[PDB]
Design an enzyme around this catalytic site. Structure first.
Site, mmCIF file in Angstrom:
data_model
loop_
_atom_site.group_PDB
_atom_site.id
_atom_site.type_symbol
_atom_site.label_atom_id
_atom_site.label_comp_id
_atom_site.label_asym_id
_atom_site.label_seq_id
_atom_site.Cartn_x
_atom_site.Cartn_y
_atom_site.Cartn_z
ATOM 1 C CG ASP A 94 83.759 -71.719 46.023
ATOM 2 O OD1 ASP A 94 83.295 -72.395 45.096
ATOM 3 O OD2 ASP A 94 84.564 -72.144 46.870
ATOM 4 C CE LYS B 125 86.687 -73.422 43.312
ATOM 5 N NZ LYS B 125 86.364 -74.734 42.695
#
Lengths: 460, 460, 460, 460
Positions: free
Chosen positions: B154, B114
């Site tokens: 995201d 991430k």
């Protein structure tokens, strides 16, 4: 501006492409794509390198080697390498520009590029050509690769040169990957290599007929006039013969061959495969003129082309080189009764033929009109198989001939429908009039490329 | 002993995993997957780089850009990029650790990572976002690649931004390859890929419902309470209606909009596509209420959550954000029949509203008990298509929306079957009790990864 | 002739060099070095890319960017970047070809190359130039290095631009190395780098007097007239004053500046620093000539060159631009008593002016004749120091201003000795006639380079 | 903003830098340098990574590794690797920020950076440390290089570890190159390297406040307080006898070594080499204080500090542990006549002691305030020879001790002159008053770095 030098064959290609956008509503409902027009017109990278290669008798020889890498929004750069004395940057940039939008219309993720050299294969041994291909690959090596740029052939598909190229890359890079296209079956080859542009072109005419005549006719019992007696023309005869049409014509460098009775005869596969067999050993229809199988129902016409001399034939497939068709021959394929044409070669029909047929379709409608379908839609079928071969090499597998053909079919059916629909979207035809394929196809290719480059930050 | 930095969102994650392993018979077969715990919780690599860019008024703006590459035993690092002012390495490590095991359960070869930045899209023009994405990608280029790390979008990073990212990478590295996920269809994009997370919750619940029914029930004539009116929630409001259930709610950041009759009333697809169309302008749900279509069938709730306001509903689909479930509102549905609540919102609940459902699961026998489902089961749908897109970019092809959904089905049904069946082994339920999914799921994904890491010599 | 693009400025460059070889006995000793002529005349590798950048008003801008890599037998490719609206492959090839032999004569291991773009600094802010340089190194990065192409400044590209270039290299490639030349002192700079261009000219010319007159005249009491007021001209206006001569004049392109008494008067450092002072704020000479400090001892001649309006001057140093002496003024300089001329600037004297001097050199003997020594003999000040800076950056040290100048001196001393002796070696003049430095220098630069290229197996 | 985590010792480092700049006239001539201020707070690249390694009883370890690459405008990133139990990114950022400007002041081309681990060599065998260094330089290899980032040794990393680090790199990259500093002579080691860090600090003092004295205080006839008997502290005494001083004190761990005769005898070289001898085997000084040579000339008080007991000193060198100055040990120094405190170790002074010294600096004249010598002027000698050693390995040669000392001298004279001149330049002292040298120093390093990064377009 002023510094921007002479590359005529590119400049006119740019205008003709811009012209399609200008002669449409696209630019009326997207004035930001003008800001894109100028960005793409400059290629993303061009490379030129000196190519030095020792000859037979062992002497130092210098030529110029090139690779124009035009666009990369859609996928890795894809194109072909062309070895001809008349090659400069001007012609390959021209060829590179066309390649962009042709790859767009295939639906595969492929960019646009073109390259090669000013080497003449004629008067060279395959042993001299070998050392040349080595030396060409040696200094292009660093600007190409499987995810970056995948070259190919052009002026005629033989894998002989592709063979030499891929060998030197492997010897340099210690890698086995789809860096090139049109490879031999043993070393990463596609089956349906030989039937990519030939079998593919006929399918489009199959797709042509059904929409155009709204399915009351098909290739069944239509006479088809092809130029060329080579890779494109034989395999482009055969799909017509498969669909119970007829091959009216064949042609070469020292004359054409036509069937005498123009309504009720054709070239059978057996008749074609002889000229296939002759052309590999560099023979003509001067070596076939006496034959018992040929003499009795055929006519050789020396020094001539198969458009005007054919009396009545209803399709045209110019599949030899570029500018075989002139103004003279062009309207002859209007008075002969043909309503269907695509150039099986690259740019086979002249700008006069191009101007002629679209100009007819502009101001004549319904059944009367001939439909010139663009190279970037019909002749797309070579470069799709090339992508499907890169896809095979990526997957590291080899496909059944039918599975590759099955997809080739579907690519051409969507390519036709995209050009068709994009024409109606922007250049809405008057009632009766057929949609514009040069317009639909160019706008369909330009919008995919343009829109991608908007979302990839190359224009804003 | 406590020398490390304080990372409050990752510590939340850590307990959840560890505790589930401790509350199970894992260690009654396998005490060496204990020591595993400390190896994986340390990342393989963390990247943090300064981003400089320019705003529309020409000034310097200086920002912090990040990429945690947590684990890669199963496949290349896989992970979204998120641009939100409150992001730091604490939150990215947290999100990264969860990602690992979710990708494990898909069965695709995908690692966990991430990244992103602390940049706030709010106020910033799509034009400023462009130059920022360029400058963000510019340093990240060196730490990513299609076999190494493939990021995604995201919170605050969408396909528009993924467009800008992919363009800069290609311009830097001179390659066309699947370095990012959630790409546009034309340039290496997957179908269903933006709309995968919402199919993910519904399909999971259906089979989850069935094991609950032990093979007898579906959304057919079931009333569903959904929060959220974004990507996951709308297509999950549709997908229940596809199988024959009813949508009694939807919501955004302002509040919720619900039907009058929460027993047998619902929305329609036409009513959902209204929310779909309007939200892409960031325009509210308060705006829907006074239309002809809405006011007289519905009630908007000014500043509420939609758990306490639906009445007799057994199904909850929290598909907005994290901490959109609290105990008060959860219990409100427990007397109303909440027996199903799967989480696509990766972390729709926190420490309080984790507990109560698991405690309910261990008493109210059979289907009378609640099944609160893990994030690593339901929202996995979106990240599967990411892998199937990497698979497509490897193959260099696109699959149809149907073909991608067909496979997506298998992943969700197997994900449930893995967690469910692993739960029975380790968190053996009493007869009358449903198996433990936050046990099954956490143990299922963790054991595969530990098992692989033993074989790859990362622990001994 | 016919498959080649027409590139005039290159043809003249190649012609003059071929012509010098033809008017010489090189081919009489070594007829294999014809094979050497032809291989190097084609560049090894040329790059062309699209350059996209943004203007002040956030408008998209497109240019074409280039880097010709001509030869590298001697060393890594070396040569400046030029940002000018006129820039095209004809001019870059031209500049690229000449660079090869100039680097040969420095002795240092440097190849020949040239590049840049059709960016116009004029009407671009330092802010737009910044964002341009960001977008320039981006697509050149891959084709360069300290051990490959090491570019520099030229018309329109300064250390300020080389600053922006070097920043992007560090950002894209995590490397800090001498990829570019003419850097600031603190970040990989040489001393004498800002000074080299003027100092170098004089040293070369200094040897010419001494050899020719056999040390019976020197810079004491010889009038030296400078055109230009640039970096180049100031340190040649100081360096003559350093050695005991007198600076006649200064110039740019709104009019020249001359002393009242042109036989004994000079400029002074204090008066030079005013012209240096004005040029930094882009104020011309016409603007300053009113001063009490200037107007009393000088006369401004508007719109005119200072060559015919000197009359009595003994050395001539073109230090401005190209073709800043024409045949008229060149012959006029012959009548005034000028005996030495060498181009401190790039390409100062016309080939006609040169040949007017070449005609004079052939028919006058001893000191008496005028000696034009082409740019590749004196202007190596800035290109040798570039190599010495790469040498400093390699050693990772700084050398003292004196130590760098000391070597700069010796490089011009060997450059003179090479051209002089190579003239006598092949093109022995009739006794009393001065050696040919267009011949000596070109043969000296060609043969060393060809000799490298022979033993590196690139011609045989 | 709101997301920034708690990052202490870097805020202190940033505060001390920012505050010093803001309390000066720099920003009176440089208003854009606030844009610079914000850029340099954020490091350009930081990697933070898992280390796994193995121990003698076959136990797995996880330990955590770091490498901050803070800035590289001046040169490749430079900064040591430290293995200390208390290491986090807070401390490494802190050390990293300081390193930038310390390299700047030397004038050698070096950036700023810092890394290492939280691994404690204490308790670990040289065999466990070996396998740790292997495993550390498995995963940092890719983020360093001789042209990219050049690490070195620090707390817990010695030449033994430098060997181990460089050995693993060579196994990966197949390269022999100066990645690291403090190497053995035979395999890339410089011949003042152990004796550079100490010699450099004394040299500075020889002229540091001597320019105030108007060159009247040779490093002779100064009473000294030395806190430390390690490498840096020992060799800071060996040069002193050469310059004509006399050392009263030293110090270690359990207690202190201070003279009976506070105005008389120095240490002898033989007496220093006695302390040096036991520091290889970590044998203490208490073992030598019982001997006739030292016991009758010194006084040991265990558990005290060496600041006041001397009674009279003219210098203070906190070059022992991390901080060994308290409030009470910080005004008596002023009463004894010490006006030249020279920080030996990092954070050697306490901020309270400093803020007594800051108060003293403001309340005085020019040669007898207790001029505190900054973080980045004195220990610069240690990191400087690293930049000659990588330069030696680049040149592929080894220099004799004299040649290395010769350059060390010039580095220290320019380093002092930078602080000196930059103080007077910006923080212009009142007549009589000594400037701020920590302000000279902080401004000196920041302006050079800002200047480079302005030219490289990283701020504007």
């Amino acid at each position: 501006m002023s510094n921007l030098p002479v590359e005529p064959e590119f400049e006119q290609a740019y205008k003709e492409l811009a012209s399609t956008l200008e002669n449409s509503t696209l630019f009326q409902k997207n004035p930001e794509y003008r800001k894109a027009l100028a960005v793409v017109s400059v290629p993303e990278r061009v490379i030129q390198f000196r190519v030095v290669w020792e000859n037979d008798k062992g002497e130092v020889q210098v030529n110029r080697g090139f690779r124009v890498q035009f666009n990369s929004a859609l996928g890795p750069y894809k194109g072909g390498l062309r070895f001809h004395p008349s090659v400069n940057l001007s012609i390959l940039k021209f060829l590179g520009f066309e390649q962009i939008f042709k790859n767009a219309l295939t639906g595969l993720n492929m960019g646009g590029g073109k390259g090669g050299s000013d080497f003449d294969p004629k008067g060279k041994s395959d042993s001299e050509i070998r050392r040349f291909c080595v030396a060409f690959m040696t200094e292009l090596c660093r600007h190409i690769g499987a995810d970056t740029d995948v070259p190919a052939g052009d002026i005629g598909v033989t894998g002989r040169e592709i063979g030499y190229l891929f060998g030197q890359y492997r010897k340099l890079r210690n890698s086995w990957e789809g860096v090139l296209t049109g490879k031999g079956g043993s070393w990463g080859g596609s089956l349906i290599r030989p039937e990519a542009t030939g079998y593919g072109v006929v399918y489009y005419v199959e797709h042509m007929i059904a929409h155009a005549t709204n399915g009351a006719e098909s290739f069944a019992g239509k006479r088809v006039a092809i130029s060329g007696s080579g890779n494109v023309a034989q395999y482009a005869a055969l799909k017509v013969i498969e669909l119970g049409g007829r091959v009216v014509s064949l042609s070469d460098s020292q004359g054409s061959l036509i069937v005498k009775d123009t309504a009720k005869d054709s070239f059978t596969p057996a008749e074609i495969d002889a000229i296939a067999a002759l052309k590999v050993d560099r023979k003509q229809i001067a070596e076939l003129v006496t034959d018992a199988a040929f003499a009795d129902k055929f006519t050789y016409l020396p020094g001539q082309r198969p458009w005007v001399h054919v009396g009545a034939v209803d399709v045209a497939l110019p599949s030899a080189t570029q500018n075989e068709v002139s103004g003279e021959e062009a309207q002859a394929l209007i008075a002969a009764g043909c309503k269907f044409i695509a150039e099986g070669s690259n740019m086979g029909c002249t700008q006069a033929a191009i101007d002629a047929f679209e100009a007819h379709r502009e101001a004549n409608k319904g059944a009367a009109a001939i439909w010139y379908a663009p190279g970037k839609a019909a002749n797309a079928g070579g470069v799709a198989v090339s992508g499907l071969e890169m896809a095979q090499n990526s997957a590291r597998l080899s496909w059944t001939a039918e599975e590759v053909d099955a997809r080739l079919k579907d690519i051409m059916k969507s390519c036709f429908q995209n050009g068709l629909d994009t024409a109606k979207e922007y250049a809405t035809p008057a009632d009766g009039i057929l949609p514009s394929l040069v317009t639909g196809s160019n706008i369909a290719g330009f919008t995919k490329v343009a829109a991608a480059m908007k979302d990839q930050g190359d224009w804003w």
